[PDB]
Every structure is written in structure tokens, then in C-alpha cells.
Design an enzyme around this catalytic site. Structure first.
Site, mmCIF file in Angstrom:
data_model
loop_
_atom_site.group_PDB
_atom_site.id
_atom_site.type_symbol
_atom_site.label_atom_id
_atom_site.label_comp_id
_atom_site.label_asym_id
_atom_site.label_seq_id
_atom_site.Cartn_x
_atom_site.Cartn_y
_atom_site.Cartn_z
ATOM 1 N N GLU A 75 42.467 -64.147 44.191
ATOM 2 C CA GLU A 75 42.324 -65.819 45.033
ATOM 3 C C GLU A 75 43.352 -65.907 46.132
ATOM 4 O OE1 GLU A 75 46.348 -65.240 45.238
ATOM 5 O OE2 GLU A 75 46.011 -63.775 45.214
ATOM 6 N N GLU A 95 44.224 -61.442 46.802
ATOM 7 C CA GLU A 95 43.026 -61.892 47.765
ATOM 8 C C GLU A 95 41.926 -61.281 47.561
ATOM 9 O OE1 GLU A 95 42.782 -61.160 52.086
ATOM 10 O OE2 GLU A 95 44.480 -62.017 52.569
HETATM 11 C C1 LIG Z 1 47.567 -64.296 56.886
HETATM 12 O O1 LIG Z 1 49.081 -64.682 56.196
HETATM 13 C C2 LIG Z 1 48.647 -64.686 55.401
HETATM 14 C C3 LIG Z 1 49.895 -65.345 54.771
HETATM 15 C C4 LIG Z 1 50.154 -64.954 53.293
HETATM 16 C C5 LIG Z 1 48.469 -64.379 52.800
HETATM 17 N N1 LIG Z 1 48.186 -63.930 50.834
HETATM 18 C C6 LIG Z 1 47.343 -63.410 51.335
HETATM 19 N N2 LIG Z 1 46.935 -63.860 52.789
HETATM 20 C C7 LIG Z 1 47.367 -64.131 53.060
HETATM 21 C C8 LIG Z 1 47.503 -64.308 54.488
#
Ligand SMILES: COc1ccc2nc[nH]c2c1
Ligand SMILES: COc1ccc2nc[nH]c2c1
Lengths: 346, 346
Positions: free
Chosen positions: A171, A314
């Protein structure tokens, strides 16, 4: 939907028994390979796998969405990061991208509710420009939830046709550890203090407020724990919904899904709540550094393989575990047999 | 030897500081990648790595040797398995072989004391046809130990020239969890009951005898805990010695070594005992299912990445962790930067 759910296949016990037998005869002391053995048997039971532990193509699905709750001061990342990062996903510069590439997996970026103009290259399944603020009302409508469930499910199973055999779920949405905490609390019966984490570096001073927000979401919405769809729609989010959808689809399709971290645990609780038949398709990846990790996992009865202190999301953890899944297959297929060496072990 | 030991390089703090800085600027919330970040910084500090986290060629070194203690009824695998399995190593049918191939690593089988005729294809560094029975005397002579240390060390560092940047260590020798328990007990000050495991499926009834054997080895030999070479030679084994040697060599060479399971922990305690400067080059892999694992690890101050309930040995855990090491490099090198996105995070 009731259809979908009904049609989730049970694991093939017959295939499993054959797998175990085969495993037991490999060039090694029986059971010496621990969880790698178990993993392999688990894979053999999955119908979409054709009676054997095998891995064809691999994909990581990233559900991106914004959340109204961001306005409650629960997240220090600027809202726009969802949109920015989502775009980055398309360039292969993000953490998941890098890890997936290393795993030979393909990343699929899906926009289920980003509060921004559409991003080319991103799959468009946008429900709305961000979900409702759970602190003062539901995230969305039941209908809206069921629909996304359906749509994501289908998309998921459809990849199966393209040769995908292994899914990873992820996500992207600023402030998402909040609805996540709410769901965990609800499904688990734990107090918010217990499940609320620092998310993306939330200052310790700001914790207190995050907990209040969570408690509020709950009291105001009165989500029913025995109804996963209810929970999701009330105090969940578009991205949470989409993750649950991937899970339902992979299960219907008879395929394995790798979980990620805390957010993913939340979605898994919901999917299992909605359809217990989903359980057997789930595969833990890593053990998230988020505070509510242990509780969520305990409720899932899952012990992750990797202890990396990760908390990026992610779907980075998911990608990271893929080689482990491949290893179990290699073991299964490439190891020699005891009998062929004339070796006999108790 | 004193030379070797003296010449072990300290880590490059300068390289490390640059690494951290670079890591902090990647497309993500600072420190969000946990142990993957730490791992990467650790690699940057290794002189043989050229100031950056990088992985060239990979090799797994398997030290095979027989042990006199086998006659004390401590191992249910037939003695000949060492020789058989060793031969199998040459065919790529063993657990390590399969896992290494999956990791793109090359397996090196080294005979340091097998009680059998030489095996073609196996590197010959044979000290004797099995070590002495530790229950009634020392495993070998001090000289014999130091020599193997030297020889293995050199061989190890010599691979470095061939483009190897990452080592994995492993062993093969029926009844080896016994001397391993003895060493742990000694270095750790734990009672034998605490460190003695089931090894390769040793029946629960036979445990008691294993512990007695261990206690005996100790009392009879009076190994000095402040002298790793002393310990190794008295209640260790050829294979234990060889593992320690790999560790000293990789460290001298300024390169990283991946540990395996329990046996490997034993050898690491000795290497650290002999040369603390070795520590920083060591990288845990998995958390062995052997009973004395937790204690041994605590004394090493190491937290493994993988929880697989593995207990096969052979360096199977080591191979399994290689992709993790590769992942940290990919992260380091392929991720995009925050600044380039105009993203600012606290
Ligand atoms: C790139 O900055 C961020 C901040 C929060 C996040 N959460 C997942 N990727 C991220 C990237
Ligand atoms: C193949 O039979 C055996 C028995 C013990 C072992 N220990 C490591 N590999 C082994 C294989």
C-alpha cells in the site's frame, strides 16, 4: 460477491500428503529444514499451483489512496507524498520497486483513492479523491466497499491468467497507519494505546493525539467486529479495502499471497473475518516494527520469517520474502533422495 | 598467525559515515528500512568492499570432518554419512547446493578430517582420518589447530582474489553438535544441559548420555575459556577449526562472512575469542532450531534475520541469507532520492 466468496477452494490435502512424503525422503534428516518444509507443503495444497510447490511469475500489487483522517494531525508526511510516491512507483525508484526487481517480480500500482489528478501509468480504480475522515464518520459506503472488493478481486485473479502464481500485497497512503490501528483494535479487542504506532516517524509527543483519534473513530462509527465489510467501510480506507480484495482474489484463484507489514496485517484480519477460507493462502513475510504488529500477528496466528525492523510499507516486505518462497520450491524439486544414496535415517 | 591476526583491518568509519548519509536521503522515511539500512552501513565499513555496499561473487565453504566422539553414542546418523554426503556435495544434490545455486553462490567442499578414503572433487586439507574422541582426551594438538587455521585462512583470502566478496560458512560431520555444545558451554559458562540439543534427530531418551559426554569432555580436558585456540583443539574438531579459519581469513581480507547455525555460532565464539577484530565482519543468517542457539547468539550479541526453524547445517542457512545481503546493496544503489522529488520529511 457472495459467489466469489463461496467459490474459494479448499486446499488439496491429497497433494499435500504427497508433498510431505517426498520431502521426507530428501537428502537430509527428516524435518531438518523446518519452516522451509512447511512452506513447501503449504504451497502444494494450493489449487492454482498444480499439485506442486512452484513459482511462475511474480507480482506486487500496490494500493494507493489518501485518507481524510490526515486532517486530524496524525501524519507528519505531507499529503501530496501519496501522489508523488505513486508516480515514483512508475519509475522504479521506490523501495518496493528496487526490492521487487531484485526478486524478479513485477510491481502493479493501483490508484484506488488518491486525492490528486490521475497519474498516467497507474492503474485507475479510483473510488474517490481520498476517503472520508474516520474521526467524524465512515470512510465510505458499504456499497463502495463491496464494489472495490469485487473489482480488485477480479483484477487479481485475471493476472493469474497471465502466468502470475505468486502475489505480494502493498500500500501507499499518507496517514494509513491510523485506520490500520483502528481495525486492529476492533477485530482484536485491544485498546488503542496498545496498537497505535509511530507510523512514518511520528513524533512521540504527537502519539497521544493519534490514540484519541482512533478511539473516536471507533466510538463514533460503532463498527461491528463480526462484520469485516462493516469494519472496513467504517474505519478502514480505500487502500485497506483493495488489499483485502487482492487477498480474496488470490484465494478464489487458488493462489498464494505474501503479506507485508502492519497495514497488510489489518487487511488480512478483515479478509479472514469475511472469509476464513482465505487463511490457508496467506503467507507472512516479515515482522513489522510497528507497535501493534505482535497483537495483529497473534490474532492471525502467524509467525513471520524475516525480522528486519522494517516499517516502510509499499509491499517492500512482501518482495523481500519472495526468494524464500522460491527456495522452498528449489528444495522440493532439486534435492537428491536418501534412497539413491543408500542412506537410512531413523 | 600472530601476523595474520595482527593484520586484521578495522572498519572504515569514513565510508560508513558516507553510507549513512546517503541512506538517509533515499526515497523514504528515514530509518524506515530498519536492519536493511544497518546491514548496508556495515558492508560499507568493510575494506575489501571498496567503500560501498556491494556483492561480487559468492562462495559457501563447507568444512567436512569426522569425530572420534561418535563412538560415545551421541549421534544416530551412521558415521559414513559424512563421506557420502561430502560426495553428494560434489553433485549439487545437497541442501546447501540447492540453496546456493538459488543464490548464485558457489559451494566449496573441503575435507579437513573425514574418516574415509579421499573423495575426488573435494578440496583436500585433511588433517587426519577423524579427530580424537573428546570424551577421553583432546581432539587434536595445538599445532594441528594453528596449522589448519593458517591453511584455511589463506585459502579463504585467496578466493578473494578470484572475485569473491561474500563468504558463507558451513560444515559436515556426523556427531558435530556435541563438540559444538562443549565449546558453547565453555565460552559461555552455561551448563551442558542448557546447550545440548537433539542434533540430527537424536532420540529424547539419548539426550542424557549426550550431556554426560559433554561434561566429561570438559572435565577431562580443562579447556581454557580465555584461549580460543586452546578450546578448539581440546574439545573442538577439524571442522570447527576450519570454520573459525574461514572467519579469520575473511576478516583479514576485509570481507564479510555469513554465519549459518549452531555449529557456526560455536566457531564464531572462538574466532571472536581469538580475535575480537573479527566481529565486525560477521553477519548472522538464521536462528537455528538447536537448543543452545539463544545462548550462543546472546554471547555473540547477534540477532539473526531469518526464523526458519532450520537445523540442517551444511551452510544452508548462510546461502539462504545471501539475497538479503544483495537486497541491502540494491536498496543502497538503486533507490531514488528525496531531494530529487522535492520531498521533505522531518
Ligand atoms: C518518500 O517519502 C515517503 C513518506 C512515506 C512513505 N510511506 C511509504 N513510502 C513513503 C515515502
Ligand atoms: C543425508 O543424511 C544426512 C544426515 C545428517 C546430515 N547433516 C547434514 N546433512 C546431513 C545429511
Amino acid at each position: 460477491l457472495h459467489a466469489l466468496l463461496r467459490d474459494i477452494p479448499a486446499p488439496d490435502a491429497e497433494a499435500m500428503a504427497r508433498t510431505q512424503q517426498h520431502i521426507d525422503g530428501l537428502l537430509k534428516p527428516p524435518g531438518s529444514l523446518g519452516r522451509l518444509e512447511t512452506l513447501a507443503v503449504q504451497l502444494a495444497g494450493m489449487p492454482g499451483l498444480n499439485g506442486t510447490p512452484q513459482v511462475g511469475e511474480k507480482a506486487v500489487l500496490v494500493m494507493c489512496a489518501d485518507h481524510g483522517v490526515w486532517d486530524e494531525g496524525v501524519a507528519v508526511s505531507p499529503k501530496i507524498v501519496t501522489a508523488i510516491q505513486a508516480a515514483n512507483m512508475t519509475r522504479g525508484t521506490t523501495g518496493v520497486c528496487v526490492l521487487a526487481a531484485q526478486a524478479g517480480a513485477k510491481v502493479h500500482v493501483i490508484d484506488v483513492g488518491i486525492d490528486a489528478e490521475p497519474i498516467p501509468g497507474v492503474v485507475n480504480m479510483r473510488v474517490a479523491r481520498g476517503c472520508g475522515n474516520i474521526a467524524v464518520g465512515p470512510a465510505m459506503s458499504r456499497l463502495q466497499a463491496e464494489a472495490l472488493l469485487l473489482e480488485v478481486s477480479r483484477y487479481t485473479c485475471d493476472l493469474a491468467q497471465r502466468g502470475v502464481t505468486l502475489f505480494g500485497v502493498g500500500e501507499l497512503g499518507m496517514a494509513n497507519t491510523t485506520p490500520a490501528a483502528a481495525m486492529v483494535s476492533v477485530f482484536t479487542g485491544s485498546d488503542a494505546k496498545e496498537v497505535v504506532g509511530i507510523g512514518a516517524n511520528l513524533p512521540p509527543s504527537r502519539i497521544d493525539n493519534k490514540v484519541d483519534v482512533v478511539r473516536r473513530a471507533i466510538a463514533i462509527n460503532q463498527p461491528n467486529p463480526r462484520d469485516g465489510i462493516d469494519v472496513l467501510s467504517k474505519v478502514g480506507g480505500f487502500d485497506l479495502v483493495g488489499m483485502t480484495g487482492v487477498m480474496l482474489g488470490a484465494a478464489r484463484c487458488g493462489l498464494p499471497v505474501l503479506l507485508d507489514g502492519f497495514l497488510s496485517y489489518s487487511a488480512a484480519l478483515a479478509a479472514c473475518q469475511i472469509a476464513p477460507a482465505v487463511r490457508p493462502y496467506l503467507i507472512p513475510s516479515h515482522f513489522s516494527a510497528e507497535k501493534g504488529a505482535r497483537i495483529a500477528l497473534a490474532h492471525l496466528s502467524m509467525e513471520p520469517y524475516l525480522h528486519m525492523a522494517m516499517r516502510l510499507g509499499e509491499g517492500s516486505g512482501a518482495a523481500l520474502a519472495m526468494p524464500i518462497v522460491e527456495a522452498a520450491c528449489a528444495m522440493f524439486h532439486n534435492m537428491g533422495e536418501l534412497a539413491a544414496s543408500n542412506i537410512v535415517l531413523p
